[PDB]
């Protein structure tokens, strides 16, 4: 069999993978100031992603 | 507080508007006091500036510098003038922000639309005085 | 390009036929700047934002032209599945526009129907 093929789940996996990226240095200056320590970067070994 | 059914009055609201300044808000807060020679020509005490003006530091510690206005910054309402600077450790020179109120206008570029501002405000000052 | 191309009022002063040829060129040009996106060129920098705006301008104006011609054709007859959309903004406002008040008092009690003070006095 495939490894659940359905597009609705598949797109979310792609989106979340893109989302789980670090905050990019430059923007911390172009926010004024406020510690942009993302939060929406998760790691697979810990927690669980809901659909 | 003091009187009148109007839109605007709230200590929080006054701060909120002027910090993040929409374009009309920027220009009215970009009004910088004229030097005395210019005050008697255009018959106003203050007008919005430009970038091809020249502006002299009167108020601060930095007093005595003159330069052209290099940039104007919306996001934290500040203006940046040439030669009012602080030195970084390596020897780089970076501009120090100055408020438009502090600095006083040496020289004007008239323009055409900016010129219209001078005429309307001048007419304003004529009406009350006489 | 490295400079921005053109201004909206210029495109207004060009024909529908002229601007569709321009639109083809803009799309071709965009694909060049997309490969240069990877390169990080100073040429594409400003330009790749601005070319999308150029594409948008030509598409808006041609559509507006079609609607104008359509309206002139339609105004004689009974009409509009398209212009009807713009006129209303539908459902709540649609129920409120029979015109009730005038129509009810169009017949029965209308000869004498209102207070004088003037009007009935002035006109006799």
């Amino acid at each position: 069999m495939p490894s659940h093929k359905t597009f609705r789940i598949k797109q979310k996996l792609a989106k979340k993978q893109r989302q789980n990226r670090p905050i990019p240095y430059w923007i911390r200056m172009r926010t004024d100031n406020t510690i942009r320590y993302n939060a929406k970067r998760r790691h697979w070994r810990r927690t669980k992603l809901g659909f | 507080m003091k009187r009148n059914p109007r839109v605007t009055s709230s200590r929080r609201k006054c701060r909120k508007a002027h910090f993040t300044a929409p374009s009309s808000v920027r220009r009215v807060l970009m009004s910088a006091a004229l030097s005395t020679e210019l005050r008697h020509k255009y018959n106003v005490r203050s007008i919005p500036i430009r970038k091809d003006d020249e502006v002299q530091v009167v108020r601060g510690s930095y007093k005595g510098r003159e330069g052209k206005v290099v940039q104007v910054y919306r996001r934290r309402w500040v203006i940046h003038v040439e030669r009012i600077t602080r030195e970084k450790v390596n020897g780089s020179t970076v501009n120090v922000g100055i408020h438009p109120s502090k600095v006083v206008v040496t020289k004007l570029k008239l323009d055409k639309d900016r010129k219209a501002i001078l005429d309307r405000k001048a007419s304003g000052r004529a009406a009350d005085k006489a | 390009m490295s400079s921005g191309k053109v201004k909206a009022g210029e495109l207004w002063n060009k024909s529908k036929d002229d601007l569709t040829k321009q639109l083809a060129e803009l799309k071709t040009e965009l694909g060049q700047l997309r490969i240069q996106k990877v390169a990080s060129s100073g040429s594409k920098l400003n330009r790749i934002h601005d070319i999308r705006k150029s594409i948008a301008r030509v598409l808006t104006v041609i559509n507006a032209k079609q609607r104008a011609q359509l309206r002139l054709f339609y105004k004689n007859k009974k009409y509009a599945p398209l212009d009807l959309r713009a006129k209303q903004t539908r459902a709540i406002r649609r129920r409120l526009s029979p015109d009730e008040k005038s129509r009810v008092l169009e017949k029965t009690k209308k000869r004498t129907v209102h207070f004088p003070q003037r009007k009935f006095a002035i006109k006799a």
């Binding site: 789940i9 809901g50 659909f51 | - | 903004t89």
Partner: protein
């Protein structure tokens, strides 16, 4: 063997799966219904006993709303003005 350890370890069945409408794992597969909005369903699932936290989720915040707002503001649907054209027009008032 018994409870907890053996309860966790199997889990090779699926019930609640991704809903298309609301984007929440709540679609009960073998009874084909979403328990977070109703997926086949004429009406969206609304409960007025389900209080603070849940109600606000369904109120949304990925909303448009601004697009809708502008017709409320004007109330009309027209306007007309094309000033600022070489002549020097009427494009600098007072």
């Amino acid at each position: 063997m018994g409870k907890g350890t053996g309860s966790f370890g199997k889990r090779r069945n699926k019930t609640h799966t991704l809903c298309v409408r609301c984007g929440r794992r709540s679609f009960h597969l073998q009874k084909s219904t979403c328990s977070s909005c109703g997926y086949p369903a004429a009406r969206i699932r609304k409960y007025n006993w389900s209080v603070k936290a849940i109600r606000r989720k369904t109120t949304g915040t990925g909303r448009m709303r601004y697009m809708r707002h502008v017709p409320r503001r004007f109330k009309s649907n027209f306007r007309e003005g094309t000033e600022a054209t070489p002549r020097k027009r009427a494009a600098a008032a007072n």
